[PDB]
């Protein structure tokens, strides 16, 4: 009962990531709040957005670093765009494309802070490739960030992120 236990830990918003839209749908059925489609490693990933929307998903995020790809995801119903902060004047362009919610992902909290200063809505800290990543949550909260997402597959690590002020937990399905 991953979702159920995440809820018990105190997770108010839970996102699920997967290369298989079938996995995102199962997470939707289990109560996930956000489904994350990854377009950086496959073709026409907006077709996953279309499927999941037809199957009732109401909150879809789309990870891409390609402008026409991000635009197609918005057109197909994606609610959150996730872009790379490691390379932001792109924020205003994403806005004008039509993005209502913009998330930035980076291994470096300094990049996440720059994105925040330029108008990003969500900052994503990645704990799958480094230790004690909740220290990034800590710093970002003290630097004014109010909406931080934390990607990890370790239970104690996810809990520590919540305790340090992460608002969204991203788990890999």
Author numbering: 8 to 94, 99 to 184
Reported in the publication:
Protein stability can be fine‐tuned by modifying different structural features such as hydrogen‐bond networks, salt bridges, hydrophobic cores, or disulfide bridges. Among these, stabilization by salt bridges is a major challenge in protein design and engineering since their stabilizing effects show a high dependence on the structural environment in the protein, and therefore are difficult to predict and model. In this work, we explore the effects on structure and stability of an introduced salt bridge cluster in the context of three different de novo TIM barrels. The results show that despite the similarities in protein fold, the salt bridge clusters differently influence the structural and stability properties of the de novo TIM barrel variants depending on the structural background where they are introduced.
